[PDB]
Design a protein around this ligand. Sequence first.
Ligand SMILES: Nc1ncnc2c1ncn2[C@@H]1O[C@H](COP(=O)(O)OP(=O)(O)O)[C@@H](O)[C@H]1O
Ligand SMILES: O=S(=O)(O)C[C@H](O)CN1CCN(CCO)CC1
Ligand SMILES: OC[C@H]1O[C@H](O)[C@H](O)[C@@H](O)[C@@H]1O
Length: 477
Amino acid sequence: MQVLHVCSEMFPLLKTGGLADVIGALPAAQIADGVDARVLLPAFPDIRRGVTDAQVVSRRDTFAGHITLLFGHYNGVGIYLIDAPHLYDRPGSPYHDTNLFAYTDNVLRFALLGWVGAEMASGLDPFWRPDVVHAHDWHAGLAPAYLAARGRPAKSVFTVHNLAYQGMFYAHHMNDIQLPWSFFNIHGLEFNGQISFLKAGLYYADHITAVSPTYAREITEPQFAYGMEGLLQQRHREGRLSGVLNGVDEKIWSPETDLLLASRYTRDTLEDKAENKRQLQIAMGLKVDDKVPLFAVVSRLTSQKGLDLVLEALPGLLEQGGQLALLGAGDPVLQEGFLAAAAEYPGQVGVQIGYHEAFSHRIMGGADVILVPSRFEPCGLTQLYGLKYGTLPLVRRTGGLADTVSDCSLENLADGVASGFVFEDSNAWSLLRAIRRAFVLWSRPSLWRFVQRQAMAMDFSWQVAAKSYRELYYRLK
Ligand SMILES: Nc1ncnc2c1ncn2[C@@H]1O[C@H](COP(=O)(O)OP(=O)(O)O)[C@@H](O)[C@H]1O
Ligand SMILES: O=S(=O)(O)C[C@H](O)CN1CCN(CCO)CC1
Ligand SMILES: OC[C@H]1O[C@H](O)[C@H](O)[C@@H](O)[C@@H]1O
């Protein structure tokens, strides 16, 4: 069974969110579980420089100009790179320019990604051909469309990591992407009078996967599907929609071996976590104090994440004696809101705006609680990292958060299953009740430790997840 993943990022070469973590870890797990998995990425500069053994496979002309298909390895997995400097050799984000505006040729940049994924099924590489093309998110959404147009020389799965990003382009671009004009149809890639790469992925794939069992249910609802729900309801009925939960990469997110930490620690030696908290407090300019709970955020700052609710709730949190440490980047309103809070409450609120990979580990390893009050959350990895690090997640019951965190209710505590704090509604009052629950648990240190050890006993394994994907691939044939 040979599978090609088609996507736009991969940890540690290029990362803007959880997708990169998935692509950095899933393929190696699949290989251990008996599927020959390879990855296809655009040759963005950070990616191209990471793959040092890359060699030329072939040159092709394309609706978007010439490519050199390269192939090399990273961490033992086979990586194909689409080297097309006129599209991909640009500094910064792969998705937008430095003024945060989408590149005007994005339609071509990402249409090409899907085209190469499909061409691989037809022998673009004379020595290797995938049985299944596994496309991820809108960026790779045309891969199943190009496959369909060619008579489906391989099977395809499309996985949604986030349905809010639709890959919308003006209809006239049908002229530019070398797909049959008949594809521009509601029974096709058309959506609200435009081309949607997301729609294309959802429509043309043999099978759709979402990144948690409950998100897969949620996206059949208007509230989470933003117009796509009719298609997804139909595919559900056809047995062509399922959920497979992400794992966590233990090479990188384990307090037991984490080299980025002041002090490594384990489920049975949580006293060794204390030094990380002390150093985190110092680093953030917070009062150094082990008697007080330190809440944390490591997050993109967009409305998805419900961090406006944290701002609303902050005074109540501080009033009860807590501290906040936030690391994040995104909406300037949020950035300034949090910067203003750090200014207003020095020694109680520490804030760092920007993307800092190493610092996220130091937060995860030192904080007592990780706040993930999401409006929607296809899976969420930060809460999984919190569980593994014994930093209790406080989450809204939605998407993967609902699948992975067990509230500290009476039953869950009595059954030995409690692992964090859960609230229901997207408002600050509902958040504040879960925050109070945390303060109550904090006042009972031995119960807190009991819950920490349960959180750290939870397992989210890529090789287990790989087993589910493998069943899917063989079923498709
Ligand atoms: N500002 C940041 N600095 C460092 N890492 C970040 C930052 N923001 C998010 N991350 C990391 O990016 C990943 C986010 O993944 P996830 O929780 O699935 O949410 P999303 O993909 O929606 O951003 C995690 O590895 C998280 O630690
Ligand atoms: O905003 S764009 O649609 O132009 C580009 C991407 O969709 C933005 N993202 C969302 C988060 N991603 C990785 C997080 O898992 C994919 C890049
Ligand atoms: O699948 C990896 C990640 O993809 C998306 O970015 C989602 O927002 C996040 O919930 C998920 O964990």
